[PDB]
Symmetry: none
Subunit: 344 residues, 2 copies
Amino acid sequence: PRGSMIEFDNLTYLHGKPQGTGLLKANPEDFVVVEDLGFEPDGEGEHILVRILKNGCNTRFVADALAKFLKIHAREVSFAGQKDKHAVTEQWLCARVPGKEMPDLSAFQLEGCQVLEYARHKRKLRLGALKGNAFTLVLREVSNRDDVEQRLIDICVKGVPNYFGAQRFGIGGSNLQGAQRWAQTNTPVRDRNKRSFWLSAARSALFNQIVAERLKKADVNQVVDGDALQLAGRGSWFVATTEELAELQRRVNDKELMITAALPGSGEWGTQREALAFEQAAVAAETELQALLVREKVEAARRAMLLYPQQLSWNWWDDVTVEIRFWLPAGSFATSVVRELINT
Amino acid sequence: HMIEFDNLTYLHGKPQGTGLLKANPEDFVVVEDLGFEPDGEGEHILVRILKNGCNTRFVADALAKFLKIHAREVSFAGQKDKHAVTEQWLCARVPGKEMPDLSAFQLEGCQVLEYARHKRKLRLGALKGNAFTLVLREVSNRDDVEQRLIDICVKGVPNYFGAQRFGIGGSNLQGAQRWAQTNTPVRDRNKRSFWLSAARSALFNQIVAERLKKADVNQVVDGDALQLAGRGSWFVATTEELAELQRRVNDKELMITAALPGSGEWGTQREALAFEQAAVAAETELQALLVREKVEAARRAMLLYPQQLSWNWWDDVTVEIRFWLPAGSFATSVVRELINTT
């Protein structure tokens, strides 16, 4: 059975493959993540926002525990996003518990999880409904400090490819594999979760591939006729035209606009003419995955090709250990930044 | 050439899901708001009628018959078509103080809800606004819709003129463009209005689309024409006042406007005016047509904040949404930012 599609480790680099190695997440304390909702709990509402700090367990696990403690169905507990199990993460959970009474969540004890705050909120917390995350990482046993230092400087200026991290395609890549097999047939998928995982890996893999192809051009950030340019910090995007190229390039160079790559699916991809031809050619061989996404009615969307870590700063503890801090928008991965610093 | 409707910039970005709007007339309920209660005296009789399956003019002629008066004695502030359910007000001139029994007036598909005398005649465009109740069906991405409804509560939507403004098949804009290329006058007065209206509306939509491409959409600039919320009055922003003006705009007390090109001054000045002119610089022919026909330039809020926006999800693929919009604003403009339709 001949397999596929550019593999993750073969994805193009913006600053070239690093000339050094290092350790990522040697200890959970070396990977701290603080969720950034973008809003404060209202202080009223039928929902209860619970801010927790965890270590050594996934979000759903703590969510199920929270549900049990409040004597409510696991379905009554949601969250903004999945936080790494092997790391120190802080995030919000949301449980629907209507009423004027506020349950004593300070009694909720669970190994590898500390409650830090809880208050009522009107609307339920939905997946993907967060602003971003603040990261504090420590890279250990850095074999080439000068290479890493130089890369951190270049990242501050040019950024890094906004790839979906390896964690997006399932353990061992099962999600992408399963998505591929399912696309080779017409056998519908029962399990709602198994279906979402697969559809997500498919579109994510295609996005990464389009970006990897675009990075093979002479000028990676060159705006071309028909590009879908997204305003920095938000979803709104528009189509570029030959007539406006000069001014558009300036905004893109100034990081006001973001060249985007397609997130394949039903409907139109967004790009037009030249740019559209490019994206279609970049994944021309993936007719099967493309067709799968279309039949499952997963609307095509736009995603920034590049990623500019915010408030990027770093400190070297010694010639082989660095602490790095930065904030990333929702949907971007810290591993996409680290990929351009060291090889793991 | 000119930005096409479907390519008009989105405030919240193009939706990542689809759905059905107005599957049946019952999924689109529009309740007219006069902006006042009838005087309860006067030579005119205001009649509120629930309409489903026929248009205004039709019901108006039917009322005229029932009351034994000239069809042109029945007026109305806003026209509406069959495809939607509308609680509309009709105005009949019946001098005197006696109140005819509008309980015998039974037209197919209609229902008289109330009636009272009033002093002034009801005129087209005199409506203050409309309250809508819509049912979006076969929603493919609830999460997307939910977040967009929430974002709209905070930021609103672009106050675009809906497609209906450009005639069936876009014929009104087409007619305006063909007309703009010749000095030939236009016979039919109805054609004149529809065409001039489509041209100015298209220009406004393009200016807003351009403005939405800026880093900060609601950023006030020197020379901007700011309109007081709820009314037509507007004034020009000045550099020395920006911080204060910006606060009132963020607080939704003032509305940044975009031009409705026509004869006379557009309203904006300096920077803002230069921006608006460039935004439609290539539309010289349509502009000259408006100037030529003496259609006075005017102002229209760039953004639209649906009032009392609330919604209820029947199931994962069905939502009933309610909101009030001032006259001149479109429900389709709110929906454009929620789902993609065909």
